[PDB]
């Protein structure tokens, strides 16, 4: 038992704290050798580097799954949301933490997988997903065909992405840290989603005398926020 203190926020977590780093790379600021070709950004060290805890979701016996697209989930929340509305250029990592509360008589397995550039599927039609289908905000979306991962791929092979297993008889928490995943040094936050954190009940939740509720808590914290400068002097 320790604390995940990050600036203004802290979460009481379990002793596991495996902290799977995506592709074995800590998030970091944009290197100088690559910042010369583009506009120089100014890094907010506070208070964007803090844990944002969303509303807890309900894990029932028939749940298909939930996905949150970043930074869409935090585009209208707190200082990060305020910053993205005034700066037109954005670049940051993420630190997603998922926690579940259940008794010793509960069972079920969750797959916390961070899918990069997850394009939605819209099964059985030739028309692309609308704006309302992809940008769900902090509410998040719900998988309709979690087997095919809602993109025509397979959930069986989804383990190639940075993933963490939650087995209610072994552990109740997961921690995935995501670096900047893009082909460009910086990107627009309001139109593009770099990551997509998904929780899928691979093994259905079940019990006999339990509450059949088992809330799930999700927390996302930007790691190294960078935004384009907005107060550069024009003199000289």
């Amino acid at each position: 038992v320790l604390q995940l203190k990050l600036g203004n926020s802290a979460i009481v977590t379990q002793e596991a704290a495996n902290m799977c780093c995506a592709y074995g790379e800590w998030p970091s600021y944009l290197p100088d050798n690559e910042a010369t070709a583009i506009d120089k950004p100014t890094q907010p060290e506070t208070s964007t580097d803090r844990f944002y805890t969303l509303k807890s979701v309900k894990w029932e016996g028939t749940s298909t799954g939930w996905w949150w697209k970043l930074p869409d989930a935090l585009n209208q929340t707190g200082m990060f949301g305020q910053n993205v509305q005034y700066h037109y250029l954005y670049r940051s990592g993420f630190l997603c933490h998922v926690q579940c509360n259940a008794t010793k008589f509960h069972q079920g397995a969750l797959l916390v997988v961070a899918i990069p550039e997850h394009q939605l599927g819209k099964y059985n039609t030739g028309t692309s997903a609308s704006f309302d289908d992809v940008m769900k905000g902090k509410t998040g979306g719900v998988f309709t065909h979690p087997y095919v991962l809602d993109d025509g791929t397979s959930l069986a092979c989804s383990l190639i992405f940075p993933h963490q297993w939650i087995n209610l008889r072994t552990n109740n928490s997961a921690t995935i840290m995501l670096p900047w995943m893009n082909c460009a040094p910086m990107d627009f936050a309001l139109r593009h989603n770099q990551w997509t954190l998904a929780i899928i009940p691979v093994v259905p939740l079940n019990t006999s005398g339990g509450t059949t509720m088992v809330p799930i808590t999700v927390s996302i914290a930007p790691m190294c926020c960078e935004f384009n400068g907005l107060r550069n002097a024009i003199t000289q």
């Binding site: 692309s128 997903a129 704006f131 992809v134 025509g152 791929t153 082909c183 593009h192």
Partner: protein, 217 residues
Amino acid sequence: AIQTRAVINQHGTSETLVENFLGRAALVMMKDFEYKQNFFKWTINTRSYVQLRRKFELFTYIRFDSEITIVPTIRLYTSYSGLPNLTLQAMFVPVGAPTPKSQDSYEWQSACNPSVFFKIDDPPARMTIPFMCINSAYGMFYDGFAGFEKTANGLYGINPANTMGNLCIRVVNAYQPVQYTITIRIYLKPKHIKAWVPRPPRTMPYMSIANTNYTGH
């Protein structure tokens, strides 16, 4: 129905390199046009055929240089006098330039558009297209929109920076007394291939060319 078994002896791993996996010159397009649309026009892309599309979609970002080979064949119609040795012009139009609208269009003379003049009875034309993207790598999957306004929300997963350019082929001495039908085969060989972030392979059949929708079976 015969259950045969053979002893397999293997060594080495250079065969499974991504450079070798994706460095196979494959058909990307094949179109036929008549003597008098009147010419060949096609924007370069990989997703045209399912096999190559699935091969490429195993990765999120791939950066490569494109080598294009044009193999023209000519078939005559209706008396016979032989296959003419017609001159062919193949022009690459970058993403920031206009494309021709007819055979005798002004853009055929543009000095900023590379052009190759080759004949039918010659070896197939061949040229290399360098990596010509705004970003540092092509993106096969785009989880975003092009803009903040309407008439763009209907284009989800389309990044304008991911376009590869237009290839236009015409016959310079097109007008001939009788007839001919010309078939153009385009072969694309990626070079200096680098890939990032592998993804699960596609399982369900494709439903559209640029929207990753899926159906049954």
